[PDB]
Amino acid sequence: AWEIDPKDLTFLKELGTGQFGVVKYGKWRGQYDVAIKMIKEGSMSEDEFIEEAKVMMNLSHEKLVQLYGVCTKQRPIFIITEYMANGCLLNYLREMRHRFQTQQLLEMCKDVCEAMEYLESKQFLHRDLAARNCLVNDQGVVKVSDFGMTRFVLDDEYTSSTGTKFPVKWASPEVLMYSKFSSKSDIWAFGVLMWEIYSLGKMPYERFTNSETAEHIAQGLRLPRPHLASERVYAIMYSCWHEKADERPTFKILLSNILDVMDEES
């Protein structure tokens, strides 16, 4: 069912390397485009992922990268997903920087917010939402990728908030202080992602070290307004950064806000 026969996979092109190793573009039964994570030995806690894949198979939204299945009668496993031709949102922004109208930037934000509203409705946390974890297809559509996958990482520099790889600059204060994850820490990260989009892929808090960033946000300081963002757009991303998690809006509310502004600005 979810179990895919690796004999049905053709490996066509390498797409790069991530936290779990090499990812390739290929075909399933020679016809259907797919992306295949060829999990690297030692990079993932595969046993727990295989069980959690049973839940994740039921997460289906047009703005979520779709899990197609898993090859588990072999080790290490393969994770098969929808293919996104334009790759990482972060690189897409940086390459297409002067080619985007502001209306286009807001629709990208909307795409991600739709995905996250769906995950929120399923009480499913992303845990590492950022432009680097969003992909872009051949329609210029942004989809959210590798939601929930932080759980399975075997890399202390990534999983520890004091590690060199921990996504400090997307983390809400309660994540950094107490490792308290919730849909409200995903909301905080989404605000930073909106900032990345409107900054055409600039690194947030680029001048700061992770510890300087943690101190900065603890004191109530935030990110500045990218000039391509109107005050209406900036208000949306800024609302994501309330000190108190329970005062942050839900993705349902954010989506409504984004659609309001899309009407107003075009």
Ligand SMILES: Cc1c(NC(=O)c2ccc(C(C)(C)C)cc2)cccc1-c1cn(C)c(=O)c(Nc2ccc(C(=O)N3CCOCC3)cc2)n1
């Ligand atoms: C998700 C991913 C990773 N990253 C990870 O696997 C990863 C693992 C764990 C994490 C956590 C830390 C959160 C646990 C994060 C990420 C690394 C390499 C490739 C892909 C990937 C996936 N899919 C599903 C695609 O369609 C695709 N598509 C591409 C299409 C094109 C190109 C490309 O080479 N391009 C783009 C267009 O113009 C030419 C250059 C590259 C990738 N690229």
